[PDB]
Amino acid sequence: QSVSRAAITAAYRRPETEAVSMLLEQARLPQPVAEQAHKLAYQLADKLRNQKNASGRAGMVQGLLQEFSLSSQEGVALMCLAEALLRIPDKATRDALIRDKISNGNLFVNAATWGLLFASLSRSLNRIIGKSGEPLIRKGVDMAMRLMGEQFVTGETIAEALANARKLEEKGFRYSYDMLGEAALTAADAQAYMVSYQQAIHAIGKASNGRGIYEGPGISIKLSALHPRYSRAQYDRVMEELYPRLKSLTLLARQYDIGINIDAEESDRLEISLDLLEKLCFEPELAGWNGIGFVIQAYQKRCPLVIDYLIDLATRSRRRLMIRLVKGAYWDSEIKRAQMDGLEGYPVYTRKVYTDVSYLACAKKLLAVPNLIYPQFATHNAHTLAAIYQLAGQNYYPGQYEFQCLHGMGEPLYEQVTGKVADGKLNRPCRIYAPVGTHETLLAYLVRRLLENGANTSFVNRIADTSLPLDELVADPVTAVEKLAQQEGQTGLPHPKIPLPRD
Numbered sequence: 281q282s283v284s285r286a287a288i289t290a291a292y293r294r295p296e297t298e299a300v301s302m303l304l305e306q307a308r309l310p311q312p313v314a315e316q317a318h319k320l321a322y323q324l325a326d327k328l329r330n331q332k333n334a335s336g337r338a339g340m341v342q343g344l345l346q347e348f349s350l351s352s353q354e355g356v357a358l359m360c361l362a363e364a365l366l367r368i369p370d371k372a373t374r375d376a377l378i379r380d381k382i383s384n385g386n387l388f389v390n391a392a393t394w395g396l397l398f399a400s401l402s403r404s405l406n407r408i409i410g411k412s413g414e415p416l417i418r419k420g421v422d423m424a425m426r427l428m429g430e431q432f433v434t435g436e437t438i439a440e441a442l443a444n445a446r447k448l449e450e451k452g453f454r455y456s457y458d459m460l461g462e463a464a465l466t467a468a469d470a471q472a473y474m475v476s477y478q479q480a481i482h483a484i485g486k487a488s489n490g491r492g493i494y495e496g497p498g499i500s501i502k503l504s505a506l507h508p509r510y511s512r513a514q515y516d517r518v519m520e521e522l523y524p525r526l527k528s529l530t531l532l533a534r535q536y537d538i539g540i541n542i543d544a545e546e547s548d549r550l551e552i553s554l555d556l557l558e559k560l561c562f563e564p565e566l567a568g569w570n571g572i573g574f575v576i577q578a579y580q581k582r583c584p585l586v587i588d589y590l591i592d593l594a595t596r597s598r599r600r601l602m603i604r605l606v607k608g609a610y611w612d613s614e615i616k617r618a619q620m621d622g623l624e625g626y627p628v629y630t631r632k633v634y635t636d637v638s639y640l641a642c643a644k645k646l647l648a649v650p651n652l653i654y655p656q657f658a659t660h661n662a663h664t665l666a667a668i669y670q671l672a673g674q675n676y677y678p679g680q681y682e683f684q685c686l687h688g689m690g691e692p693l694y695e696q697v698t699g700k701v702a703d704g705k706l707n708r709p710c711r712i713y714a715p716v717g718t719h720e721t722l723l724a725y726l727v728r729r730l731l732e733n734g735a736n737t738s739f740v741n742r743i744a745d746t747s748l749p750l751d752e753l754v755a756d757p758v759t760a761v762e763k764l765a766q767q768e769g770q771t772g773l774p775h776p777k778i779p780l781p782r783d
């Protein structure tokens with residue numbers, strides 16, 4: 281094993297106090313940069329929360345919830361009457377109603393819409409459940425999956441989604457298309473996925489039409505879709521069978537000069553994906569071409585060591601690697617997986633703030649080597665974006681880096697980001713990750729979107745919480761870790777509720 285590969289393996293389940301301590305100074309923003317990151321993070325989160333004046337309207341609510349000293353139920357009912365009084369066409373009649381008959385007695389149609397500014401279903405469920413059974417539960421889950429999943433899908437076929445590309449692409453967005461589907465269980469499954477990926481590359485590459493890997497659209501692929509039972513696949517079978525499919529897809533992407541990105545999945549597959557990447561990078565037919573993309577997950581303890589490996593690989597193979605830095609999508613599964621195995625520790629962090637610190641340290645490592653790596657910073661977190669904006673230094677050039685976001689999640693934040701400075705934008709490119717597929721391929725992806733959007737540690741969840749002040753929402757992660765350090769007695773202790781798998 282090479283030097284960089286060996287250091288990866290040694291960091292696999294490093295104790296959290298040790299790994300967070302090492303990361304801390306690598307992630308610390310210098311005082312002037314930290315200041316500018318704070319102001320920018322604050323300003324992005326302010327426009328985000330207060331689009332359509334959501335805070336200022338809640339302000340006028342509380343200011344009258346006290347001025348008359350009324351309840352919340354007793355105050356929404358006042359609006360329903362106020363709305364119904366504003367519907368009297370003539371002010372003469374409206375006022376005379378208030379000064380004559382508005383002290384005796386008495387509609388609440390829009391009490392629900394007003395309540396959004398200010399039970400017995402368990403019975404209807406118990407009745408329906410035992411009556412219609414498991415087939416009713418299975419249909420309810422399938423319906424709710426499509427209903428909640430619609431917002432995250434750009435189209436059922438690649439052609440449908442490609443036809444939606446111009447709107448935001450003319451605004452300066454880019455796209456990475458994902459043919460939904462993963463964890464192939466049979467040879468037939470992985471074959472079908474292979475053909476789905478090939479057809480997508482032809483379609484995406486004809487749409488790209490020479491625009492190249494930076495400005496033009498790319499594709500994202502999941503290795504688990506290409507090999508049957510990837511989760512437990514032996515090394516020799518993966519090289520013999522998966523690798524020639526990865527190679528074939530990458531050659532095809534090169535012919536069209538489009539970016540081809542290898543998504544990161546569960547942590548027990550990191551090692552074998554590095555082996556496939558190492559081989560792919562030395563194919564003669566790919567010499568001189570920089571379209572190979574690779575995702576790395578900052579919630580893993582190995583991420584910084586993976587970066588030193590990737591830096592050495594780009595040098596040895598004479599290319600610029602497209603590296604998408606993400607926090608990670610499989611955190612709940614990682615925790616549960618590690619607890620069932622009862623091993624030395626976790627391969628991921630157990631406090632969200634540690635992942636934030638890991639992401640900022642890794643971002644610094646990536647931005648230090650623009651000749652070897654084109655960093656792609658995938659995030660919906662206003663502070664994370666603002667910190668990367670400042671970390672990247674003055675004198676941005678389009679090929680220095682890009683942001684990325686998921687379809688259905690990033691658009692309000694990146695409306696402030698991609699576009700002209702004259703229109704109030706930061707003028708930074710963003711690549712939209714665009715899932716494509718029908719209902720039969722949506723389940724696993726929708727669930728990870730639900731876990732992401734529904735966690736109270738997620739930025740997109742906290743920002744909807746108007747009782748959380750903006751300064752706490754965009755608080756600096758290194759400073760947060762040192763707060764816990766001072767309160768708890770040492771830096772980087774595991775989450776209090778997530779004991780080691782052996783405890």
Ligand SMILES: Cc1cc2nc3c(=O)[nH]c(=O)nc-3n(C[C@H](O)[C@H](O)[C@H](O)COP(=O)(O)OP(=O)(O)OC[C@H]3O[C@@H](n4cnc5c(N)ncnc54)[C@H](O)[C@@H]3O)c2cc1C
Nearest residue numbers: 543544607608609629630631632658659660661685738739
């Ligand atoms: C364009 C794009 C492509 C992506 N591709 C991939 C991919 O190929 N593979 C993949 O795994 N992820 C991928 N992701 C990331 C994943 O899907 C989430 O979108 C991402 O992790 C959210 O980070 P955020 O900075 O927007 O949110 P933030 O809310 O600031 O952070 C949320 C993240 O913190 C982490 N986290 C939550 N709780 C804890 C905890 N208690 N301890 C430690 N860490 C915690 C999780 O990673 C969670 O997603 C991608 C994201 C984007 C935007």
